[PDB]
């Protein structure tokens, strides 16, 4: 009600696309599979989370596999940290010369965005609005 008339210097609007059910898991302080490698909200997140279904456009008959999520990271997520390193992690003694394999993984895996998905699992376009105040 008061978000219409509250002054914040900046709004961090983060736009992306994920699976349907995972939206409610994006909460201030909530932890999960995304809160450690892709995007974690700060423990003092004062804002909003919006998500709308886009199965009509973001789903292919043969399978829309253009969207990817990152699985591994060299460290745990701190409040509003962006690690986008494409260097393959070395989880053992095997040198990772740009190719896939055990202990040599490119951290990105494709989303299975297809019309077959149910409403709670359809591709949702999600925007997180994090308001900043001094």
């Amino acid at each position, epitope marked *: 009600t008061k978000l219409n008339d509250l002054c914040f210097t900046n709004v961090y609007a983060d736009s992306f696309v994920i699976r349907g*059910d995972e939206v409610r898991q994006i909460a201030p302080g909530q932890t999960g599979k995304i809160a450690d490698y892709n995007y974690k909200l700060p423990d003092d997140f004062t804002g909003c989370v919006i998500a709308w279904n886009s199965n009509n456009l973001d789903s292919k008959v043969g399978g829309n596999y253009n969207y990817r999520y990152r699985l591994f990271r060299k460290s745990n997520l701190k409040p509003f940290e962006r690690d986008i390193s494409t260097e393959i992690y070395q989880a053992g003694s095997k040198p990772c010369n740009g190719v896939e394999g055990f202990n040599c993984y490119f951290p990105l895996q494709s989303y299975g965005f*297809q019309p077959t998905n149910g409403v709670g699992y359809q591709p949702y376009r999600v925007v997180v609005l994090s308001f900043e105040l001094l």
Partner: antibody
Framework: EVQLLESGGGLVQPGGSLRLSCAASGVTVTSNYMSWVRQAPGKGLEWVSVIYSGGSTYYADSVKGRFTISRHNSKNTLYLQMNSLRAEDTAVYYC????????????WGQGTTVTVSS | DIVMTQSPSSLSASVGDRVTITCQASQDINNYLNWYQQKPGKAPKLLIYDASNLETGVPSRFSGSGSGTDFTFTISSLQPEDIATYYCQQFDNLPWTFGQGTKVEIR
């Protein structure tokens, strides 16, 4: 080299606290997901609890407060205490690490049998 | 919330017979389905991932198909090494409710 061993359990009296230890080498406990699973003798799988990376512990509703979890970075090991264990919890316990959406939980650990029978 | 129960609960066949397993969920799951082999006594072992690619060790007789809620698993020739219980579950929404489980035993 990578190796996962377990310790803890026996034939202690009911109401006797115990402490399971999961010693893993070759991985990073701090930045990996892990779970505890108990299995009855001669039965199927039965999940118990989950630990995430960064200090986030959760269980099922029946085991809401079961565990007291701590870690030691000297040997990258987990210690996990239960106060006043329960009678039917006699089972083989496993600490497990799941890779999730890139092939899920291929190889299992050792698993130790704990009997809290009267 | 989401409870995922196997369509087959108890299937018994002989050596070399076809085995058909249906793995359905309450609603659509994607990329969160694995085909395991626990076996009596020994530690559980995952064999088939993503239902499309064969892993090192699994014979080519095993096949998987499906894109969406229902994934189907076919064994053309049952072997004594396949005496086991297949479990496919939803490891997405806690708590993890248990399924029926497809216990395949040879005769």
């Amino acid at each position: 080299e990578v190796q996962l061993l377990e310790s803890g359990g026996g034939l202690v009296q009911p109401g006797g606290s115990l402490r399971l230890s999961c010693a893993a080498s070759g991985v990073t406990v701090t930045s990996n997901y892990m779970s505890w699973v108990r299995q009855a003798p001669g039965k199927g799988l039965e999940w118990v609890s989950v630990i995430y990376s960064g200090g986030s512990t959760y269980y099922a509703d029946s085991v809401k407060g079961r565990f007291t979890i701590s870690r030691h970075n000297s040997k990258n090991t987990l210690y996990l205490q239960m106060n006043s264990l329960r009678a039917e919890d006699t089972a083989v316990y496993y600490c497990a690490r799941d890779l999730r959406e890139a092939g899920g939980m291929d190889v299992w650990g050792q698993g130790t049998t704990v009997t809290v029978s009267s | 919330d989401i409870v995922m129960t196997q369509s087959p609960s108890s299937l018994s066949a002989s050596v070399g017979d076809r085995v058909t397993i249906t793995c359905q969920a309450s609603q659509d799951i994607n990329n969160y389905l694995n085909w395991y082999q626990q076996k009596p006594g020994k530690a559980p072992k995952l064999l088939i991932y993503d239902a499309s690619n064969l892993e090192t060790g699994v014979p080519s007789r095993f096949s998987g198909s499906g894109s969406g809620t229902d994934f189907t698993f076919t064994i053309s020739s049952l072997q004594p090494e396949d005496i086991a219980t297949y479990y496919c579950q939803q490891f997405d929404n806690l708590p993890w409710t248990f399924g029926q489980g497809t216990k395949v035993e040879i005769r």
